[PDB]
Paper text:
Several Vibrio species use ToxR to mediate bile resistance, and a few pathogenic species have co-opted ToxR for virulence induction. While over-expression of ToxR can lead to ToxR regulon transcription, under physiological conditions ToxR requires ToxS, an integral membrane protein with a periplasmic domain, for full activity. In wild type ToxR, these cysteines are known to form either an intra-chain disulfide bond or a disulfide linked homodimer, which is present when toxS is deleted in V. cholerae.
The dbToxRp from V. vulnificus, which shares 55.2% identity to the V. cholerae ToxR periplasmic domain, readily crystallized. The 5 β-strands are arranged in a β-sheet with one side packed against the two α-helices, through hydrophobic interactions. Interactions of note include a Pi-Pi stacking interaction between the Tyr236 from α1 and Tyr263 from β4 in the hydrophobic core of the protein. Finally, the disulfide bond between Cys232 and Cys289 covalently attaches α2 to α1 stabilizing the structure. Interestingly, the density of the α2-β5 loop (residues 281–284) was poorly defined. In addition, the α2-β5 loop has the highest B-factors in the structure. Taken together this indicates the loop is flexible. Therefore, we hypothesize a major role of the disulfide bond is to stabilize the structure, and importantly the ToxS binding region, by constraining this flexible loop as well as the relatively short helix, α2, which follows it. Interestingly, MatchMaker35 aligned the VtrA periplasmic domain to dbToxRp with the lowest all atom RMSD of 5.5 Å, suggesting despite the placement of VtrA in the DALI search the VtrA and ToxR periplasmic domains are structural homologs.
Author numbering: 200 to 290
The structure:
Amino acid sequence: SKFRLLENVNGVEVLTPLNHPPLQAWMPSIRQCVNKYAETHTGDSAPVKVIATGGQGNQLILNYIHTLPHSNENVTLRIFSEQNDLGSICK
């Protein structure tokens, strides 16, 4: 259950399990998703981290984790490589 840091995106740690396969190809999508998620989650409600997994086919799982007082905002989201609804999937 140890994570490696793919990237810090505007204060949000984008993490993946230590030995998870490579995800670099998803980074532009992940960055857009984090950008859009920040639009509805600011200040104390900003997520601490997002765990990225999957992505070996056309689907990536992003788990946004908040501080404990804001853990009711934690979400698992699924994004596709081809589809382009990041503005509405990532709120």
